[PDB]
Design a protein around this ligand. Structure first.
Ligand SMILES: CC(C)CCC[C@@H](C)[C@H]1CC[C@H]2[C@@H]3CC=C4C[C@@H](OC(=O)CCC(=O)O)CC[C@]4(C)[C@H]3CC[C@]12C
Ligand SMILES: O=C(O)Cc1c[nH]c2ccccc12
Length: 556
């Protein structure tokens, strides 16, 4: 196989676990924001330049696939151009140039060294080791090609804000270009290239241990500092800022990886289908890396668009975790026969149910201990999150019970499927409560709760076979798909109608409902449908078990 895809979930757990460590440490004030800069300086001024220098000196340029680099770089330049032109057209005069600077940098600059490299290493270290080189070429060449342009627009803004000025364009260009040169990523690549040539790629035996020690310390240290910097960074954005942020995160995490993939398929005219495919897949995963923390640092250095950029970088980081897991598996499925693919979807489900369960336990613990479970709409959220926890238990039980008895499968299917219908129902009932709350009303909490669990249990009672199935979604056949479908059509209608009525704390609950409704749509589409089917089986499994992670992201 082209990707060791089984190595990705541990690598994401490493990455986002160490980010979560840093986030917990900042939240708990184990480290204050001023103490965090001590780690940030080590990370950025010592560990990163050592890592860059080391890898640059070792790098065999007579084995670089320049067509991959040109592809990713043209893809980034395209997204930069698109976001820049589109920003200049859409943004208002008073900050169009800061936006046209920072939004294209945001949309293109990846978290390549801290998050990209551990993930690439996990996937490709054994199967395609030269792909690890391209982190160190794409990420710096990306900066020195695209960042000066964005900085030039920030210097144009700074010039224009200094309204009395009439100063020269060459100052703007040189000053933007100099900020690129001053970046450790850029200058240690020039230096590392110089010592690649001087040293015939041999790092000196007596300097190698130092460069190992500093460079190897980078990854965890950077991920932890990324966690610390993520604390307190998502501010309540305006509607327009939130839509813009969604668009820019879509640029970074959807448009850019699609263009990376397309460009590799244009420009890699090499012969081997397997090499072409794995490189194409790597192009997509490369595009999926979150925004680099450096962009937020630039925004702070310019004092421009800082809330959008900082929030978006944080949100991009959190959103990249599932997108990257989901994408990498999705891109692996074409290479898998249908039974290895069935077990792959259960492995995905198990992996997702682990994180979701942990996130749900935390979310429930917060809602219970804060006693927010006594309030509305939070009590309905609490019931939804209980149902989501029982779904995640259902998956981990199903993983081990999947073909191992018969009546056990019925009890494992019974509780798990009833909870899955409940998650769907509570998604609608939650939106209903938001409408009723926004209306003023004596809200019928007891009826809402007992329906949100009893209607699911009655739906499964009505359903109560396919005993040999690996996938629980078909364990009671087409009649299960019908019962699931009607449940989803109920919940989608109920939720969409009640959110529409609501449109005539509570805002976060609307965001949860929107995101879950998009998920219910996937599982309804997949039920209405019954390679694209295995892909939406993945999106259904992903949602069915992973919905608790969305709940956590919005309440945590
Ligand atoms: C791969 C497809 C990309 C989407 C699944 C991503 C790209 C942008 C993401 C959004 C960017 C920012 C936010 C704000 C955040 O608060 C909640 C998640 C959300 C809506 C994200 C949900 C997932 C989205 C739509
Ligand atoms: O985006 C990257 O991978 C580079 C980077 C530079 N300074 C950082 C601090 C924390 C995490 C990553 C980085």
């Amino acid at each position: 196989p082209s990707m060791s895809i089984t190595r990705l979930f541990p690598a994401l757990l490493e990455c986002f676990g160490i980010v979560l460590c840093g986030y917990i440490a900042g939240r708990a004030n184990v480290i204050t924001s001023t103490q965090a800069k001590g780690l940030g300086n080590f990370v950025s001024r010592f560990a990163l330049p050592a890592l860059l220098f080391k890898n640059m000196v070792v790098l065999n340029f007579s084995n670089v696939d320049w067509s991959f680099l040109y592809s990713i770089l043209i893809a980034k330049a395209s997204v930069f151009f698109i976001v820049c032109v589109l920003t200049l057209l859409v943004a208002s005069p008073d900050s169009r140039f800061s936006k046209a600077g920072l939004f294209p940098i945001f949309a293109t600059q990846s978290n390549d060294f801290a998050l990209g490299y551990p993930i690439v290493e996990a996937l490709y270290q054994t199967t395609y080791p030269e792909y690890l080189q391209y982190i160190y070429l794409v990420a710096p060449i990306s900066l020195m090609m695209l960042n000066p342009i964005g900085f030039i627009f920030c210097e144009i803004q700074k010039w224009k804000d200094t309204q009395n000025a009439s100063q020269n364009k060459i100052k703007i260009v040189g000053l933007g270009l100099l900020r690129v040169l001053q970046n450790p990523i850029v200058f240690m690549v020039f230096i590392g290239i110089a010592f690649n040539f001087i040293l015939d790629r041999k790092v000196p035996v007596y300097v190698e241990n130092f460069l190992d020690g500093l460079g190897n310390s980078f990854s965890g240290s950077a991920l932890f500092y990324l966690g610390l910097t993520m604390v307190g960074k998502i501010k309540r954005l305006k509607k327009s800022a939130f839509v813009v942020l969604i668009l820019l995160i879509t640029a970074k995490l959807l448009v850019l990886p699609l263009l990376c993939r397309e460009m590799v398929e244009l420009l890699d005219k090499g012969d081997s289908v397997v090499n072409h495919t794995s490189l194409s897949n790597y192009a997509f995963l490369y595009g999926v890396f979150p925004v680099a923390p450096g962009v937020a640092i630039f925004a702070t250095q310019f004092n421009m668009e800082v809330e959008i950029i900082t929030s978006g970088m944080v949100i991009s980081t959190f959103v990249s975790a599932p997108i990257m897991y989901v994408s990498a598996w999705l891109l692996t499925f074409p290479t898998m026969d249908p039974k290895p693919l069935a077990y792959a979807i259960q492995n995905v489900s198990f992996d997702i149910s682990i994180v979701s369960l942990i996130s749900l336990i935390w979310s429930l613990a917060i809602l219970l201990l804060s006693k927010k479970y006594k309030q509305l709409p939070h009590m309905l959220t609490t019931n939804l999150l209980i149902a989501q926890s029982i779904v995640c238990a259902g998956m981990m039980i199903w993983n081990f019970v999947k073909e191992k008895n018969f009546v056990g499968q019925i009890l494992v299917f019974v509780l798990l499927y009833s909870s899955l219908y409940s998650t769907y129902l509570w998604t609608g009932l939650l939106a209903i409560s938001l409408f009723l709350l926004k209306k003023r009303v004596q809200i019928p909490v007891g009826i809402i709760i007992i329906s949100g669990w009893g209607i699911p249990a009655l739906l499964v009672g009505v359903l109560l076979h396919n005993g040999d199935s690996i996938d629980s979604a078909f364990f009671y056949g087409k009649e299960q798909m019908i019962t699931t479908a009607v449940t989803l059509f109920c919940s989608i209608l109920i939720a969409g109608i009640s959110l529409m009525c609501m449109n005539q704390q509570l805002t976060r609950h609307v965001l949860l409902c929107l995101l879950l409704i998009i998920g219910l749509f996937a599982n309804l589409s997949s039920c209405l449908w019954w390679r694209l089917y295995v892909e939406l089986q993945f999106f259904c499994a992903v949602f069915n078990f992973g919905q608790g992670f969305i709940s956590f992201g919005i309440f945590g």
